[PDB]
Amino acid sequence: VTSVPGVYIEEDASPAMSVSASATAVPLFVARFTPLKPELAGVITRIGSWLDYTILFDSNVPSSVVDPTASVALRLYFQNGGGPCYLYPLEKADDNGPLAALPDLIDEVGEITLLASPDPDETYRTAVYGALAASLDQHKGYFLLADSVNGDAPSAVGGSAQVAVYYPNVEVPPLSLPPSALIAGVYGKTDGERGVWKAPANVVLNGVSDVSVRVTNEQQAELNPKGINVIRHFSDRGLVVWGSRTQKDDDDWRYIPVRRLFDAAERDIKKALQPMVFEPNSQLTWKRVQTAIDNYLYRLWQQGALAGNKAEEAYFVRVGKGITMTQDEINQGKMIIQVGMAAVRPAEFIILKFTQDM
Amino acid sequence: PLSLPPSALIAGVYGKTDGERGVWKAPANVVLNGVSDVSVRVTNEQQAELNPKGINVIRHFSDRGLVVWGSRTQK
């Protein structure tokens, strides 16, 4: 309604929200989002900032004892470290039509890394976690952020290394939210400031005040030798995410930062070698591919990602015809590359051992 | 007090603006030297029906004086 070329004044605005930039934590929040224009009802839309959410989606949605919590969960996402933030509005749980078409729509968009469905209903998430469980073991690089109900895994994703469960529901001034919308925020904050090789487990959660269940040490002692990753309350600090384990009990893929380092390195090598597809499958191309991986793995080692001291102890790239291939495999049009890395594990136990003898 | 059409003054402030800022700068914050007051003090609400045409009202601001206020053409 601006027509006079002067300066206009409004008086009951809401404060705007900042958004960060990250390439390793791009989530897909599956919740009960209510669109304004109904063409984006069964598709995935990109929400670059909070201002993009208020134009495309209804951000008020007045309550009726039920309370809409999907718009509240995104405000806590951008307060904890924003992102490009893909959304999939899925209204009710039991419609097995759009849930069967969900993993085929995720692959059409190139850049989803995290899943993290932020919904307070329990049977809603079980229908989502079961529909996404088959896409986690297909080497596509996704990472599910599940939520425990009473202190255990939701059993649709039992022991895969692509899943990080987070137990306590987090209360907002009081509606209780599942913590996956906030933890998806603190991944983007940690990766931008420290890298994917850093454990995302000392970040103080902005926004929220208190968790729904104050968890002691003795019940975390039976939970942390599973991947449960309790949100703890410390009096001097506030609400600190406390735990960086996955569902896999293997010695290799036990920790979140070791797992997401390999998922991010495989994703960036894949984006670098796609210009080298449909090249002539010759020894000149195999050395151009080996150097493009060796240049990438060197600049991870020199910024602290890989656990080495010589750069021959951190990584290796191997390609050849006597090595890693046979002549029958070149003739069917493929090259086979062996890449290895060595990551560093976090220190999660500190023993003090006091005395007064000297 | 004799009332003049403003085209002799606006032709002056084009040469002042282009010499100091260039032709790509909008000539619409120049305080008119010389003259004291316009013949009609134009409100916002009648400029709101005029500025979605090219009318380009000479406005009076108390701290500044007479400021040319508007940089639209007839197209």
From TrEMBL, chain A:
InterPro entries: Phage_sheath_subtilisin, Tail_sheath_C, Tail_sheath_structural. Residues 249-354 form the Tail sheath protein C-terminal domain. It holds the Pfam family Phage_sheath_1C. Keywords: Plasmid. Residues 174-246 form the Tail sheath protein subtilisin-like domain. It comes from the Bacteria. Belongs to the myoviridae tail sheath protein family. This is Afp3.
